[PDB]
Write a protein that binds this ligand. Sequence first.
Ligand code: GD1
Ligand code: GD1
Ligand code: GD1
Ligand code: GD1
Ligand code: GD1
Ligand code: GD1
Ligand code: GD1
Ligand code: GD1
Ligand code: GD1
Ligand code: GD1
Ligand code: NA
Ligand code: NA
Lengths: 104, 103, 105, 104, 104, 104, 104, 105, 104, 103
Amino acid sequence: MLKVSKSPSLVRLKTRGESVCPISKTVDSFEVSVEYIPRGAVLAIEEFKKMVDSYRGREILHEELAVDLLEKVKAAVNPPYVKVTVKSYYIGVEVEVVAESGGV
Amino acid sequence: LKVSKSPSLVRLKTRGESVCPISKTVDSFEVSVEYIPRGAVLAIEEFKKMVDSYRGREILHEELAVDLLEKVKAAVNPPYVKVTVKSYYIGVEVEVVAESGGV
Amino acid sequence: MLKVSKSPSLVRLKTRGESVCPISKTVDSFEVSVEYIPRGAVLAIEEFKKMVDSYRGREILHEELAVDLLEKVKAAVNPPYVKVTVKSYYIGVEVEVVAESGGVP
Amino acid sequence: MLKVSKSPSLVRLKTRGESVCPISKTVDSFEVSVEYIPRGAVLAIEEFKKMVDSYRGREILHEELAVDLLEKVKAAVNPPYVKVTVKSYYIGVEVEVVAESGGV
Amino acid sequence: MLKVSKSPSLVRLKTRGESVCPISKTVDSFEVSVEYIPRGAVLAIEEFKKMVDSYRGREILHEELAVDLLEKVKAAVNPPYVKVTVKSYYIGVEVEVVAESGGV
Amino acid sequence: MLKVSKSPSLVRLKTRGESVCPISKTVDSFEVSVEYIPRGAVLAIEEFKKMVDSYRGREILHEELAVDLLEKVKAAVNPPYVKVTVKSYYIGVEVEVVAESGGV
Amino acid sequence: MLKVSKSPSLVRLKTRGESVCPISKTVDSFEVSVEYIPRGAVLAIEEFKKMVDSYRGREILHEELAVDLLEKVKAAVNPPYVKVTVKSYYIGVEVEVVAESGGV
Amino acid sequence: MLKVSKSPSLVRLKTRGESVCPISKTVDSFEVSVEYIPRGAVLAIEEFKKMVDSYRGREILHEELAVDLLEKVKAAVNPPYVKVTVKSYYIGVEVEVVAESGGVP
Amino acid sequence: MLKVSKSPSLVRLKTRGESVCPISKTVDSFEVSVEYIPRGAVLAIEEFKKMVDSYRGREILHEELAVDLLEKVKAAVNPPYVKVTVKSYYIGVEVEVVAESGGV
Amino acid sequence: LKVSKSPSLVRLKTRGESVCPISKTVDSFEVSVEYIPRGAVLAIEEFKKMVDSYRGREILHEELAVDLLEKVKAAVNPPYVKVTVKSYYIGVEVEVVAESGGV
Ligand SMILES: *C(=N)c1c[nH]c2nc(N)[nH]c(=O)c12
Ligand SMILES: *C(=N)c1c[nH]c2nc(N)[nH]c(=O)c12
Ligand SMILES: *C(=N)c1c[nH]c2nc(N)[nH]c(=O)c12
Ligand SMILES: *C(=N)c1c[nH]c2nc(N)[nH]c(=O)c12
Ligand SMILES: *C(=N)c1c[nH]c2nc(N)[nH]c(=O)c12
Ligand SMILES: *C(=N)c1c[nH]c2nc(N)[nH]c(=O)c12
Ligand SMILES: *C(=N)c1c[nH]c2nc(N)[nH]c(=O)c12
Ligand SMILES: *C(=N)c1c[nH]c2nc(N)[nH]c(=O)c12
Ligand SMILES: *C(=N)c1c[nH]c2nc(N)[nH]c(=O)c12
Ligand SMILES: *C(=N)c1c[nH]c2nc(N)[nH]c(=O)c12
Ligand code: NA
Ligand code: NA
């Protein structure tokens, strides 16, 4: 969580990750965006990256994961707008989950 | 499947098979479902089995889309649902969209 | 014309064809695409293909074609909204034409 | 300028041309689109090709060109809306210019 | 600051620069964009290129960098709309930053 | 069949056509390339277009077509090497057929 | 097994199927290819489609699956060259398997 | 012609041009590409551009052009290997021509 | 390490990973292929995936990593041919390393 | 940098800047170096600094490639080296390859 006096309008951060599918205990690979308007504070990449690795080994639906991480983004830097998107692929099906908070 | 805090949107996408009524030929297609959850989440497996339900079935692309909307509405009643079907037949690319509800 | 008891919200059809350029009398390849909102009836793909094949050997500008084909789709399934897009390429020029009728009711 | 009965709603034309860069007198290669709402008339492709081609040998900024070609298309076929876009590259820089006139 | 009689509606310029990561002192690679509504004069490509080169060997975050460059464009040419986009990739994370100002 | 002085080393021609599928009497859309080493003669594009177009309405397998068009091109312009490739899609299946004659 | 008088030089057919992962009992999604030099007869698309559908709800590894299908093609049509390619994505890992036989 | 004290191993140049189709007398847009091995001298880009601009308004088949341009590059920098590739599009047909001379010594 | 009686001709496995750049202690994201002809045994994905995660937290050059993992592939399944490719990106530079063993 | 067991091949790639002699215009380019290590590895930073050496410098693309080959040969003497330079000038795409040695 990094200070900056003069703040930008929007920030997208995007990376890959790993969780577990609770139905069958298999590792699940996925992709995560986080889009946010800062006010004063700016999420650090190292931090965002730690936040994403928190789901290694852990059983969770991709729809939970997206919300879970939204709540964490608000924990650390509490911004008005935050969208989180989790793109994955399971059993021949491509999945995306957007979890949103605030207005554009 | 149920969530405490629902995500704002979900897109599922995959491939399936129907039969072309006119010609009784197998029709391969791709299909997306975009919905706003209210309480319930559609298990991926149940989505798959909805999509596999059309194997062997004679149906227009136009009807397949609409039939799948109903199904998804029935299974989890989202306030907004959009189903998209894409296929190719006799050199013609085909999309069909079936929406119900408010964004 | 194919009768459907539940009209889907939108349908796009898309395919290649050809015509003749009236200026130079050469064959003009194109993509065409019809996007429409059904009310009751659906355009059979076979009929759409027949509409597009109708332009083979026909002398006509692409701007004319988008509009000719629009009229056809109206006469056939009379939908409340129709958009025809023609895409082509002549003498180093990429060309798009769009023709529309009605609105998203 | 060829006269159709019913006008289409929208026409885009796109092609490549060249000009000279004022600063350095080297040739500039560019891509140019014109998008326009017809009224009675439609611009012949041959005529558009001649419009773009007239800039060969001519020293002009990408910015002035977008405007110059737009003024030509209004004068030729008088549409209620015209958008010209010029895309080019110069000394490691991707450049796009738009010039519009009238109502969407 | 090249004067033009008739301004275009919108200009985008895009290119690559470097700077330095504060945390780790590592040379940072990035893609950068300025979209702006010119008022009276356009930004010379050469000038813009200079602006972006100016950050070579400088300690700045991708979030601050975007903001600074927005300031510079407003000085140089004074447009009523300016958007700056920065794109990068640090430590397995893709990063975008947008910095806006005014109405379109 | 147009006669050049010095022959090129290699010509590819590629276009779209249609046929009927024997099994089901529906139309098959395909992409077809012919690659050939010229000797004195070069196949006119108009003549090639007519070759591909003659299959409209004709029931034939993609496989037999590749061969049939190859026999036509040898008969028209008699190259020491010809490769025809036919690409198509049918009931969820991507299909490619090659038919070659002679020496690379 | 469709007979043809003059065989083509090479045929590729490509499509999607499913099977089941042994370890985890999860429905496995995959892309599959057969390239073959036909001798006397070609494989009907329909037949091939059948071959690949045959694995729905079967316990097999992506490595065995490739091999089995190679066997089947050799039975059905008996070509002197056959290559089968399988492609997948299990648990964040992209997987290709090739299974050859004979000379080209 | 630009003299170079150390010849690189290969150079490709690639650009767009136009010509005229002798059949229909329309303008034909194309990509062209020259690949060569220098021995001593390098083709200036400005001269390459001049060679390609030489075909504007000129009636000529693309097969003829690949070969015409090949001869030019030979006359200019006389390299031990040259490959000219022309790419074009006429009446729904994608076209490639290749012309070669010499080998990888 | 999985048995299969009848073995395939080739297998590519490809995934992403994380190591450390020893020069500056920053996490390094990368991509890894492994291409191999099996004999009898077949590397399991779970295993390959564990082998790739072994480099989390660890300081190593990308040129070491590729060789290191080659040696590990031979540890577990000892095949004639093995290629390993590691694509990464550091300080504005795109890097690939192929580490090979045996013949094609 | 030195390796015990050398990798069989290495590709480095990045962007740089020179000056066009004819026109004194800045020339942006992309450049790859593919080499077979023998003992020594080229540090990425040293590669970068080789590529940055051409800023401000008037040089043909043809010569830049060849100059960079020499440099790489000098720094680490690989038995096979291939340098590739790509640029755009007056509407013409340019590649130059400079190889030395055996694959
Ligand atoms: C595994 N992660 C998994 C299995 N089935 C799922 N269904 C839905 N809807 N979301 C998931 O994350 C699922
Ligand atoms: C076969 N699926 C088929 C054949 N003709 C069709 N026409 C329309 N409109 N829709 C289809 O799904 C068709
Ligand atoms: C040939 N198709 C042709 C030639 N010139 C044209 N100009 C316009 N505007 N539209 C066309 O279809 C043209
Ligand atoms: C040459 N065309 C050139 C050189 N520098 C330029 N800067 C701007 N803004 N526009 C141009 O067209 C330029
Ligand atoms: C390095 N430039 C760097 C390292 N971590 C960063 N985090 C954020 N938020 N922004 C940066 O520019 C960073
Ligand atoms: C129709 N063209 C058709 C249907 N099934 C086919 N199988 C094969 N091998 N080839 C074809 O051209 C086929
Ligand atoms: C599931 N199908 C699965 C899980 N792990 C695998 N490992 C290998 N080598 N092959 C597979 O098909 C695997
Ligand atoms: C016009 N460029 C033209 C028309 N027909 C052609 N046929 C062949 N073979 N080559 C051409 O350049 C042609
Ligand atoms: C960091 N991992 C790093 C820094 N510099 C490097 N140079 C080379 N050649 N390889 C690496 O993996 C490097
Ligand atoms: C500028 N970099 C420039 C101008 N003309 C050139 N010609 C050749 N052959 N190579 C270059 O790098 C050139
Ligand atoms: Na443009
Ligand atoms: Na083809």
